Scaffold this active site. Structure first.
Site, PDB file in Angstrom:
ATOM      1  N   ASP A 184      43.853  31.274  41.931  1.00 56.48           N
ATOM      2  CA  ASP A 184      44.389  32.460  42.418  1.00 56.48           C
ATOM      3  C   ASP A 184      45.661  32.623  43.495  1.00 56.48           C
ATOM      4  O   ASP A 184      45.735  31.535  44.579  1.00 56.48           O
ATOM      5  CB  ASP A 184      43.266  32.851  43.301  1.00 56.48           C
TER       6      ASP A 184
ATOM      7  N   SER B 255      58.303  46.405  43.296  1.00 59.51           N
ATOM      8  CA  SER B 255      59.344  46.758  42.135  1.00 59.51           C
ATOM      9  C   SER B 255      59.581  48.336  42.243  1.00 59.51           C
ATOM     10  O   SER B 255      59.590  48.941  43.013  1.00 59.51           O
ATOM     11  CB  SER B 255      57.075  47.433  41.265  1.00 59.51           C
TER      12      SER B 255
END
Length: 326
Positions: free
Chosen positions: A35, A195
């Site tokens: 994770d 992004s």
């Protein structure tokens, strides 16, 4: 030194990926969920209340010669689980770290107990999020950094297939083209990045800034309401259901692809990756892979997005994130 381990999906839908890990001497092999969204190494142990164990492999520190109780230290985390802390030898695909904090579970929520395939988590976010009190502990990647050839690890997750986690090197055969590196912010303790936009199907690229985290421990892609509404508007009959808790679509439909910008590059997610099968057995409605982040507080780039690329987690003095097509 370097490390290389194979990761395998727990089921037919890619809900999670498990990686074998050697904890102790003589070794005990547990199947953990790597994770990048958290910073704790916790396992199902011999101290977990027997009612909360249903098929998992348990860590037993009494059977290990290198095990030592980290006297006084305790943990408590929510995504829930809590308990004791030991130090022991952990190895991942040949890469060995001595003195790693191994968090022994005493209590576990029923969401973990129902998943018999997952024996625990191996946190790979920044060490600032470690929940060990009163002395905060370091992650496996932070403890191996000095001994690794390069302070990096890659993620090559497979679509309905097994994949790989390498440590200390970059496999130049695993991807096509070149790697595009972007700036990471460690302020919140995640692999946080920006992004450069998106496009739905064969549409025009909307250039816009989307701040999110690269999280291997989260299954789906969580983006803002405006971006998610634009996607599902192109799928005939799709709709946000209250009862289900998100967007669903008629299983007979064909999903368009989704693109997310990394600097000047583009990473394409095929339509197939966004189909999470029927909601209930034999149902006519299918669950969506792209869901809204509105009720979370952060955009998450989960497994749906990450498994379409060769992803580099560069842990240098100034961290960066690399993405390449594969």
């Amino acid at each position: 030194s370097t490390g290389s381990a194979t990761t395998t999906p727990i089921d037919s839908l890619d809900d999670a990926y498990i990686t074998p890990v050697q904890i102790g001497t003589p070794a005990q092999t547990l199947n953990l969920d790597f994770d990048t969204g958290s910073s704790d190494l916790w396992v199902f142990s011999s101290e977990t209340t027997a009612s909360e164990v249903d098929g998992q492999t348990i860590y037993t520190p009494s059977k290990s010669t290198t095990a030592k109780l980290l006297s006084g230290a305790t943990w408590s985390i929510s995504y829930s689980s809590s308990g004791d802390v030991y130090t022991d030898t952990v190895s991942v695909g040949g890469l060995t770290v001595t003195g790693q904090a191994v968090e022994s579970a005493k209590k576990v929520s029923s969401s973990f107990t129902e998943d018999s395939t997952i024996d625990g988590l191996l946190g790979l976010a920044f060490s600032t999020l470690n929940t060990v009190s009163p002395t905060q502990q370091k992650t496996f990647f932070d403890n191996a950094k000095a001994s690794l050839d390069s302070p990096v690890f890659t993620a090559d997750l497979g679509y309905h297939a097994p994949g790989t986690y390498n440590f200390g090197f970059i496999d130049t055969t695993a991807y096509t083209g070149s790697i595009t590196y972007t700036a990471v912010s460690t302020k919140q303790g995640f692999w946080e990045w920006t992004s450069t936009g998106y496009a739905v199907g064969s549409g025009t690229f909307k250039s816009t800034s989307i701040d999110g985290i690269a999280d291997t421990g989260t299954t789906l892609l969580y983006l803002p309401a405006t971006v998610v509404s634009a996607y599902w508007a192109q799928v005939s009959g799709a709709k946000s259901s209250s009862s289900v808790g998100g967007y669903v679509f008629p299983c007979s439909a064909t999903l368009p692809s989704f693109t997310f910008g990394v600097g000047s590059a583009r990473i394409v997610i095929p339509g197939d990756y966004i189909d999470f099968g029927p909601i209930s057995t034999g149902s006519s409605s299918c669950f969506g892979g792209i869901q809204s982040s509105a009720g979370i507080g952060i955009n998450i780039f989960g497994d749906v997005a990450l498994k379409a690329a060769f992803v580099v987690f560069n842990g240098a003095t100034t961290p960066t994130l690399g993405f390449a097509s594969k």
